[model samples]
Target: GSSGSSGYPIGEASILATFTVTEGKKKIPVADCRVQKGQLERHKKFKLIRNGQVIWKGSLTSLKHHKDDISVIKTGMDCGLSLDEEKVEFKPGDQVICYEENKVPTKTSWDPGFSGPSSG
Candidate 1:
């Protein structure tokens, strides 16, 4: 089933499957940070992975979301699902990750918005 990209309801991975990240001259692994709940540091290009494989890669900057705009937070199906439940697990405080390359998807298919039903 083709679910919404961006891992909505869950956390989203990078745009490519192959890439590397570094902080202060130190190479940081992707497995250290949890997606969906955490924010990517500005000017950092992260390696994207899916189904236990790398798919896409790209950089992210910290941007504020307006009430009418979409929050940068990634979620499973745009819901509240986390990537840990799917297979993209990361340990707290870790700083390096050697991700697989087979799980990376060839394209991005995600959208962001105010999820859940609400009354305006």
Candidate 2:
């Protein structure tokens, strides 16, 4: 486990898993991400893990929720996810993961919103 002193946890609440980022083979370990909340926004902590070990973990600068379960996760780390100024790119089999949260299927299969009724 990396030092928690570097990154800080954002939200206290978790969320629904509508879209799960598939595992990819990126050299920078940008793939196999796990999001732990419903609100997918900037400054959100993400993780890339294989088996049990965490390949990389950091706060997301920008994330694009796309079709076919394909999402783009841009790194905000100035020092880089792996090493200093390491080349990072999304490759084949890579994934965008949202952690354990209950969700209800909406009209769109790609975008699964939070479970239960909406206030609005």
Off by over 4 Å in 2: 5-37, 67-120
TM-score, cand. 2 vs. native: 0.30
**Could you give candidate 1's per-residue lDDT for residues 33-86 as a string of tens digits?**
334344433333444344555433433232222222344433221211122122
> Could you estimate the TM-score for every candidate?
0.23, 0.30
Q: In terms of lDDT, which candidate is strongest?
A: 2
CA RMSD, predictions in order: 14.9, 13.5
Q: Rate the local accuracy (lDDT) of all candidates.
A: 0.33, 0.35
For model 2, residues 1-120, the per-residue Cα lDDT tens digits are 333343333322212122222337633322323343333334345544334444445555444433322233334211112211233333333333323323333445566567777696
Model 1 gets an lDDT of 0.33
